[PDB]
Amino acid sequence: HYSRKPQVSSKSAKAKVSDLRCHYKNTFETANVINGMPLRKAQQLYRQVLAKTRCIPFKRYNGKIGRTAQAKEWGQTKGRWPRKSVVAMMSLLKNAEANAIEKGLDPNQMVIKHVQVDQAARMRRRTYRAHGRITPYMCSPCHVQLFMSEK
Amino acid sequence: SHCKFEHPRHGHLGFLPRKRSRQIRGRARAFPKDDATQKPHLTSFMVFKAGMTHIVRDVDRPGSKVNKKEVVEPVTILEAPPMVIVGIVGYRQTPVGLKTIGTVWAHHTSVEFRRRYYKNWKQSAQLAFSRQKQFANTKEGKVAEARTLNAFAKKASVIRVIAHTQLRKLRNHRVGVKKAHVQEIQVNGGSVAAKIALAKSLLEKEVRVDSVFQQSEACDVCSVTKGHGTEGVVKRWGVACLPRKTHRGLRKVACIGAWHPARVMYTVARAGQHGYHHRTQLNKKIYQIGRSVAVEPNQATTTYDLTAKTITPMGGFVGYGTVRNDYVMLKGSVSGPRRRVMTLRRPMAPQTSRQLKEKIVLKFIDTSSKIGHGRFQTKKEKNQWFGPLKKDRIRREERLR
């Protein structure tokens, strides 16, 4: 039930999560950077982002965010270190690795071939403004799907 | 309608944009006009700002109220280690500007000069100028060098030498940089052949600051001013402060333009970068060209002050340290902080004024501490004042026992 089909199904592993409760835009940035990576390189990247020695490049959702020197490796100038999205994607990568191992594949040979982050159904709260106004205070969850294929 | 009253505009529009300088070193945009009747000579030199002090001298300006009277002059001390000539460049006049004909490199280059070609020298392969050094002394390389020199002789109208600073000689702990600063120094005077001969003689050789400049001459200084980051209109441009009652802030320009033209003009003061701009300052008199402290100890001793002391004040120059090499004492101030490399250039303005031709003789140089209110010129005077202290007595007790 994925938007894309793996080249060889028996050599691929799939992982999915729905209504993640992390920010959709931050997760969009965080998951997109590992598309095309080996699994191990992506996991190293997430650990180094947690350590704040490398950043997640922010594209398309970087409006008036700060500039950093760690974005230069991605050809960018704006990047951040969104830890909630990173840990959620680490859990998703662990699930994909578990699926690959149970299928009988080698987790050290997998290459992430598909990442897709979509906005989930939103959750509604309220904020209170001046002059007795009540205004939406919304949450934007996300769906994340991926599959990786052995090379 | 017209502005009610008149005052001059704030700031000089000829120093726009007020952006950060592309380089940190002072670079002479132009050189003094070339006079072919003069002997070939160098027109600039690179120095490092150590600090400031003041001197005493007797003025010889007839018609002034300070004629034959002593005045106190603040001065800037600039350390001037010898420079090394490593290259020759020639320029040809074309109707689109000067174009450099080619470069003649010295057979041997210093490690400091070759560090300038790397961002991380100590972890590099350090292969700079290696192929060039192998090729230069072969038959083909000698032929190529002769060909380039012949091209200089035939076509060049401007001859410049490539010189670099010696940071190992400048044994300074606060100057962190170890890669040499490289600049082109134009050779003025004589024919193109005479300039080529002088440049060839200077190749792979040191140049001392007293060869390029002499005492009581003036010079131009090219340097980058001290940086201050983002600043408001009050400090960046000198506009007036608004009344105390102003809503949303008073350190502003009240009107940044009329309704028409329907846009902000480039002549209106705005917030932005202040400082770290390249400036060329004119007519800095050279009050003293001192030798290295290792050669001549009594740097700051005059004829009128026999006290044996060096140009470094008590406690050293704040944030710089001691001056170990040759130095230049310029009258007044120069743009930039301490430790910044600066270019002394031979003057480009006429030097016929009574002030620019005055012969400077120093009678006193202040070497008191620049930390606090210094009141001793030397350590000897301080020890004379205090006599033996508790520490010295503890030391002598530890010695004799």
Partner: protein, 221 residues
Amino acid sequence: AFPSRKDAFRAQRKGAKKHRPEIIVIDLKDHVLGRAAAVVAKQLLLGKKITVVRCEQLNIAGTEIRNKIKYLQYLRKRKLTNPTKGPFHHRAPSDVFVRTVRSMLPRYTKRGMKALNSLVAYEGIPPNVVRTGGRVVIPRAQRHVCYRSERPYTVLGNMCKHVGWKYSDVVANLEKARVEKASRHHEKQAKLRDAWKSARKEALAKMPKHNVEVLKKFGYA
């Protein structure tokens, strides 16, 4: 301008000889600025590659002071709120000619800019154009056929050197050197030219006679 290593490698693989496009070199000396500009603009729009030299020797009708004042009036035009991005007043004579042609072109279309990039303008005759072939003139834009000789005229270089152009003396010295070199090379090769002329004269007798009569019929012998 400097070719890419890719382009040089491809040329080596193809092995083709040196290629020079068909380019017309116009000697703009003693030419009327506007008329030469109009002719050159039309020829550029027709797809021709044009290089113009000695643009410092173009002519404008009227005294030099009147044309200096016209240029200074042009220089008065600037965007007041930001002179950067305002009108750019080029002072070199070749740049002045390029601007005149550009004003006679549809400069705000791809076609007009294609025409404009096909024009190369120099002051004097630089070495890369000296030996590329015989230079042309524009008969309908030449000064001796366009101006009544009584009236004063301006040389473009003299006006430009007083409105801000810096390379008047450099161009003069380069032209002096070029003409000296070309005169030396033309005094030489005189033996070659005389040898070829005498060779044709002797061939007139060494060739079959009916061919000589045919040449006489068509005014060649």
